Design a protein around this ligand. Structure first.
Ligand code: FMN
Ligand code: SO3
Ligand code: PER
Ligand code: CL
Length: 144
């Protein structure tokens, strides 16, 4: 099973989405450092915002705890993709933390959803993660 790491604030919407997924995951805490050991997709919500014509370098979209988690070189090395949450009322900033992580960390942006996600989002992410980890079996070392 693929690795999953997520962050969720007091509103618990990303936590609720992860619980609906039926896939195990590690939660980045409100404070404190953690470490992981195997490759993972990161699920994160978007904060900050308000800028109608945004830029991926304007700070505040990626939760500070996620930035700290990815400052650990080992954690960062194991990131393989990102899924982001937000609120489409933010328009050009919808789920922008996914844009920031994907572009600045150089990993694919797999999916995005609103708040705790719909049943269709849950199914799409389950299927998308299965396809994602299957594709890694096309990158195996030579045995010769
Ligand atoms: C202070 C604040 C700023 C937010 N900024 C954005 C934003 O820029 N873009 C976006 O799509 N959603 C934004 N949101 C919506 C959150 O990403 C959304 O509510 C998310 O589901 C919260 O996830 P969580 O409950 O796991 O923390 C913001 C929410 C808050 C409270
Ligand atoms: O409340 S959390 O986003 O620091
Ligand atoms: O920073 O990935
Ligand atoms: Cl809060």
């Amino acid at each position: 099973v693929g690795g999953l790491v997520y962050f969720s604030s007091v509103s618990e919407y990303t936590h609720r989405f992860v619980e609906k997924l039926g896939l195990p995951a590690t939660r980045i805490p409100l404070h404190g450092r953690i470490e992981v050991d195997e490759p993972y997709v990161l699920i994160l919500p978007t904060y900050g915002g308000g800028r109608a014509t945004p830029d991926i370098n304007h700070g505040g979209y990626v939760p500070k705890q996620v930035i700290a988690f990815l400052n650990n070189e080992h954690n960062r090395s194991l990131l393989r993709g990102v899924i982001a949450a937000g609120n489409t009322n933010f328009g050009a900033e919808f789920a922008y933390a996914g844009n920031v992580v994907s572009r600045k960390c150089g990993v694919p942006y797999l999916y995005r959803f609103e708040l705790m996600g719909t049943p269709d989002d849950v199914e799409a992410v389950r299927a998308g993660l299965a396809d994602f980890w299957k594709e890694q079996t096309c990158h195996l070392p030579s045995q010769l």
